[PDB]
């Protein structure tokens, strides 16, 4: 089976920067390969067949070349919505084989966390559960820290996290962080704070709420 | 126009079988080849086989031969994709796509997972500012969908009119269950006045729920 090795895996670039991904086959396959994007949670799109014909419908600073065994995908002035993987597929033989995806992310300006704490809902404590979410959202760049308080003592056990892709309109990061306790715990300590750390600023940015307190 | 439309996530237990659907239209059936491709989480792409509607003929990736088996029903201009013996290796997007020198088009594809774990419908939660409030700011607002197996929810907002602001964060599993959160930041001149509602469809266990955010009570 050829195997297509592709590089970089993953490439970060400022809007209107010339990005290039390399598609390495193990053996000859002549011109019969294509190159793909595929956003989050969507299906793939063909972008060049051939290894430098592109499809009907994508943009011209998309461009492909080479052949035999070294392939190229190249961005011209690139932009926030390219933001996507990129893998090769060769068509040349059976079975047909892709490359590993490269991830491309755009650059963008810093911006600090907008952070917001919420406390269990009234439908959650009635069964028993009490969630503590917190949002840390568009952020960049993607590296974060998010630390939790209860009465002021740190909260290490039954925290979870989870983050999304660089988004595609303003190309920044968010993450959730959920913090889970049976609803007697919950009641009984009184402060819960969320705090964020990003390199945005040296101060965490706090966020709390007391169990009482109109 | 071209459409190949794939049926909803599949649960299967280990060991069982699962035959995945492709239903083509807006073309002759007959002209393209019917390929599929698997993507497992975090992997890439492996082309499983080939159909040719037109004579039948198949084409296998060897390391699926005796697992996959591709058949079409040409009066209905399907194709299917039969998995057998399966196990949690097997859990990825199976896609069909077909294409030419002039166009490529993938379906949507088909989660199937296979897990022994229960189907369980998700408990959605809104979540709302407590008693803070703010002055011609914006307010950001939740909606924690916890519990479920397996994946996937949808989240929409305002039944998906509401689009900029909203973050729907990837699920997390523990102990066989998946949790996941969505946020969406609108004007504070416009919530609570106007209403914010979120929608959570669970397709595995036929579940459709509106929370509509309130503001909390003291
Ligand atoms: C491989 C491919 C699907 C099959 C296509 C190929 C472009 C060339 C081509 C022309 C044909 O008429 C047969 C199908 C094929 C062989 C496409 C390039 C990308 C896509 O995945």
């Known amino acids: 089976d050829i195997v297509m090795t592709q590089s970089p895996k993953f490439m970060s670039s400022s809007v209107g920067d010339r990005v290039s991904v390399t598609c390495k086959a193990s053996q000859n396959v002549g011109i019969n390969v294509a190159w793909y994007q595929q956003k989050p949670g969507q299906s793939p799109k063909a972008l060049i067949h051939s290894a430098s014909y592109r499809y009907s419908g994508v943009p011209d600073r998309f461009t492909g070349s080479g052949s035999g065994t070294d392939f190229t995908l190249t961005i011209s002035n690139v932009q926030s919505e390219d933001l996507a993987d990129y893998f090769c597929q060769q068509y040349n033989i059976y079975p047909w084989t892709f490359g590993g995806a490269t991830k491309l992310e755009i650059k963008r300006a810093d911006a600090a966390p907008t952070v917001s704490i919420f406390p269990p809902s009234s439908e959650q404590l009635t069964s028993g559960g009490a969630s503590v979410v917190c949002f840390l959202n568009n952020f960049y760049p993607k590296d974060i820290n998010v630390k939790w308080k209860i009465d002021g003592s740190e909260r290490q056990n039954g925290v979870l996290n989870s983050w999304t892709d660089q988004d595609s309109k303003d190309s920044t990061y968010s993450m959730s962080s959920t913090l889970t306790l049976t609803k007697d715990e919950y009641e009984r300590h009184n402060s819960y704070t969320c705090e964020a750390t990003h390199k945005t600023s040296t101060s965490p940015i706090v966020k709390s709420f007391n169990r009482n307190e109109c | 126009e071209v459409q190949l439309q794939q049926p909803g996530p599949e649960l299967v237990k280990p060991g069982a079988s699962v035959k995945v659907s492709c239903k083509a239209s807006?073309?002759?059936?007959?002209?393209?080849?019917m390929y599929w491709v698997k993507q497992s989480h975090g992997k890439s792409l492996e082309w499983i086989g080939s159909?040719?509607?037109?004579?039948?003929?198949?084409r296998y990736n060897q390391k699926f031969r005796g697992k996959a088996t591709l058949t079409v029903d040409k009066s209905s201009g399907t194709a299917f994709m039969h998995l057998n013996s399966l196990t949690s290796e097997d859990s990825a997007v199976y896609y069909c796509?077909?294409?030419?020198?002039?166009?490529?088009?993938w379906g949507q594809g088909t989660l199937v997972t296979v897990s022994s774990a229960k189907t369980t419908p998700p408990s959605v939660y809104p979540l709302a500012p407590g008693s803070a409030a703010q002055t011609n700011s914006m307010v950001t607002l939740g909606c924690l969908v916890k519990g479920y197996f397996p994946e996937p929810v949808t989240v929409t907002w305002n039944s998906g009119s509401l689009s900029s602001g909203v973050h729907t964060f990837p699920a997390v599993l523990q102990s066989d269950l998946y949790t996941l959160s969505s946020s969406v930041t609108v004007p504070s001149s416009t919530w609570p006045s106007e209403t914010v509602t979120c929608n959570v469809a669970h397709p595995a266990s036929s579940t459709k729920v509106d929370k509509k955010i309130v503001p909390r009570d003291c």
């Open positions: 796509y077909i294409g030419s020198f002039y166009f490529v088009y």
């Open positions: 807006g073309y002759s059936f007959t002209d393209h080849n």
């Open positions: 159909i040719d509607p037109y004579n039948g003929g198949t």
